[PDB]
Amino acid sequence: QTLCIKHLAKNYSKRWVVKDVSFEMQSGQIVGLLGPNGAGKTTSFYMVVGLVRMDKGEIHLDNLDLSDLAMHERARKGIGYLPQEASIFRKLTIAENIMAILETRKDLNKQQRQQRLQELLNDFKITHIKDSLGMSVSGGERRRAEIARALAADPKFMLLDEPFAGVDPISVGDIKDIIRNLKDRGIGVLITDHNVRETLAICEHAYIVSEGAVIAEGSPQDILENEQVRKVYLGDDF
Amino acid sequence: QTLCIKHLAKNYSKRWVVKDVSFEMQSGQIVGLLGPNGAGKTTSFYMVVGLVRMDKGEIHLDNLDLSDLAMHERARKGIGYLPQEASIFRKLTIAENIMAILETRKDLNKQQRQQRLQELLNDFKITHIKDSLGMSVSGGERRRAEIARALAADPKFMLLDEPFAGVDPISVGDIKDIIRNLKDRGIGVLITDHNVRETLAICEHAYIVSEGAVIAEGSPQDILENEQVRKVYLGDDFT
Amino acid sequence: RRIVAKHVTKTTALAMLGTTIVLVILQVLFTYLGELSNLSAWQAFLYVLWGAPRYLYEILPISALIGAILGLGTLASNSELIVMRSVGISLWRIVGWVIRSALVLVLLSFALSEWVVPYTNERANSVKSEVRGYWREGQRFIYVDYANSQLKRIQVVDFRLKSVTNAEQLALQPKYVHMVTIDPEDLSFSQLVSFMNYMREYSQVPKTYQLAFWKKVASPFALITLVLVACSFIFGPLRQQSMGFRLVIALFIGLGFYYLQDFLGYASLVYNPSPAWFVLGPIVLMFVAGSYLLYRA
Amino acid sequence: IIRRYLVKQVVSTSLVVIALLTLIMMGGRLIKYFGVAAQGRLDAGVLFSIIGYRMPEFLTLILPLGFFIGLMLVFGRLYVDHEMAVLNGSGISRIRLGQLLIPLALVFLVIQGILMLWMTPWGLRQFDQLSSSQAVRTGFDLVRPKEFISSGPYTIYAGDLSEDRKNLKDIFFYQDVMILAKEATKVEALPSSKLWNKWNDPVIASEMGWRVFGPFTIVIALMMAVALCEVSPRQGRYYRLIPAIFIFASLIVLLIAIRTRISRDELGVWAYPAALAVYGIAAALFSRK
Ligand SMILES: CN1C(=O)[C@H](CCCCN)NC(=O)[C@H](CCCN)NCc2cccnc2Sc2cccc(-c3ccc(C(=O)O)cc3)c2CNC(=O)[C@@H]1Cc1c[nH]c2ccccc12
């Protein structure tokens, strides 16, 4: 599956923050949507999710135009979103968070929903907190429950927003292992992040957007040896 | 000359967030207060500034207790604060942002104040944008106006909160020169930041605050070789 | 889906009921301060306490508005509404879950209006302390000096005159005698429709009873519509705002709606068009405007 | 520069709140007056003159409330968007910022001193003459369509009524003469001069003290808005409004409860500054904790 995105555009206060941002993503592949802060990497990311309405552009997913659909109508097509901020259901237990979205899945029955919930808890090692409220778990443990909850909806493309946000260097490997696990599960991952040192370490194909347009494209090795990216975003030393 | 912090402590919701944090910072020296996120490096920083009540311990500045003084009373003692978030006076001109704090100074007359404002604008290359509002400037230029404004109060120690927050790698070096310039100005700088890799590149003495207590101390080279830090904060391979 | 539905409904229901408890307690305390003017004080606390169901009945439309603002505001500010859309739960489904919470208040509004308010109102009047000079039945004008629910100096005039009959002790019925002094607004729906049907069978129903009838039949629809407006504001203008700002705005919409429904109620008694236009005016427009803010997502 | 920055902000947002409260406090009364006019008990063409004459009465309460709310919104904004951390971090406390607004509060005190002493009585004097002129309406003036209106020895029934209260239809008049036709076409206001020296009487002792010690609620609204304005950036600019409007309103409710207990010669006129001093000292102590 391919999430073709063509000629995105959006203006704010009569100023075009995003001008002709176009990139392509495939299932089972990590793609990093990077760039200078405020240059349109966040806004172009949100127009893929659906939070920000698209002024101009075309977002197809395997000959399925997802341009006119809202946030939820795209999510039913197989697009996932993991907010940077804490988005766990505070008053629902960790097992109820995953079970809340599993009941939304129409591809299962009560018998296999409990089996799917059990293995999702075991996959992310949150079984020991399956009965604790979502508001009373560690930030590292909660984020694993948010990803497990997102995987309960069976997404084809998981768009991660700032995954390495407030993550210590000891636990940056844990996030990379999670993101690598999503790729091995057949889910394409779109990462937008301010921490470009580690986002350029897991992504297979990165898009640098500056001044509202994509200024470079390719593997992280090609991104580093790009004169425009080095001059504008990464700097002479990196 | 020597800001001394001893045995800081603070309990939030019957949980001791900070337990026996003590570090010393001298004037003209850059000190990085680092550590795992949520391990008390942020709370211990705030007790130094004054944005949270120290439940236990003391703060000294060259035989002058500052523990009982509020945030504004320490600022008169030469301690500055630079919030991570946008703290510019939004509807005031950038020249007026620096001037609003220059008029606070008692040892500066109108003529001495206009000069100081002129040279403060020139030092931070914002004299071209000195006629624009605080809320209508670039993110990079706004922070340069907040540091020029902070220097107008003439601080002896500047407590920077997340200076490398939301900063592109191109503009990280720009902040390095600013913090290096503050040290060259005879002003001690205390830095708390999540970006440990770049914070360790300017500080000459770093403190690692884990599980509410200081577990490391010394130059960034000594912090990296510490096996206790690399087990809890930095990880096996960090450079 | 049931676990998500219970979480959204229970969170909003507790916010709608929590605001209801607070708003009634404040209005009982505020009203108690006022009556004290015309003072015994205890005789004045029971009169205000007995009026609580009637203060409760008039708070339900505004407690449901604030309840949905605070109930969904807690969900919105915690980024919980974003992850319901991220899995395929529409905006109109989340609104439908909030409406389920408001449907408890609508049923509570019916119970107070039909069986509770008309009883505690009568008990309140007694604490503070049978129609006299009652004045048309088609072509006949009837005046009775004293009328009892179980007559004195009757006078009936027939119409050109035929007979002016007088007695010392016709379509008048004792059942509706006690409803004559009661204001049309205060009458319960069971009492109002029965009284209007009685007047319409023999005379013309005044426009102050038509307005009272329309202000009651459109009471459940103003509670649901005002909830939908609250939900659309959370997904629209009041998204990412503080909890205090949402509460402040929820108070301005509540007063704006109470003033608009008060003014357009009065305007229906002075202008030719039927009171249905003035009562169902804002309700239809707020539903259309509220449903448009939901279409903008 | 920091004083002019605050005065411009407080004046701008206090005038917005004052105009917002005037639209709400007297918009509700204007609608209620319109409700009386819709039943014929008040001329529809004069209800805008009633609002004109009750401007000083409501603005007597809104001005301390608008100043109090406008003070906390400004001081809340400084806290929310981190302009207070750089003002405290530069040596300027919150108490010092509230002391920069004493010249502004004195202007608002003088303004309300004009309202309380002069325009509130003058507005209530003209309103009392006007309202008493609307209480004499009787007969065909109070008629309502499809209803019987009895006023003394008159009983009037009109089958229809125009949008204006003219051109009646299906008129029935009873005394005994029966006519059927198809068509038919206070110390609160006394000038201060009087209560100026006429003390030693609970009536004036309560009113005149209410006019002299009344304007000083602006000062209390200044040092109590400074005390109750500390709010976190994530909490919001409006977080401490509703909790602290009730703390301010508890002062006014106490002052209305003192005006009455003086009118009944039970408390004495000395309790006006005492009520303000207790709230003044409590606010000063809380701002310095
Ligand atoms: C009975 N009072 C009034 O007539 C005031 C007068 C102010 C508006 C007109 N100028 N107005 C009212 O009461 C009317 C309702 C009465 C029917 N119209 N609206 C609520 C209203 C308007 C203005 C102030 N309070 C109210 S209701 C209220 C609120 C808080 C406390 C109290 C209260 C309760 C009990 C006692 C006691 O037992 O001694 C004392 C006070 C009250 C009750 N109101 C009072 O005691 C005052 C006392 C008062 C006399 N003149 C004044 C001029 C300015 C301010 C207040 C007064």
Ligand SMILES: CCCCCCCCCCCCO[C@@H]1O[C@H](CO)[C@@H](O[C@H]2O[C@H](CO)[C@@H](O)[C@H](O)[C@H]2O)[C@H](O)[C@H]1O
């Ligand atoms: C702004 C809220 C923050 C805190 C506020 C603190 C106090 C709030 C003040 C509320 C003012 C009360 O409002 C006052 O209620 C009393 C209730 O007896 C009303 O009183 C009215 O109805 C009663 C009930 O039959 C009659 O007996 C009375 O003659 C009549 O005037 C007043 O018309 C109204 O002005």
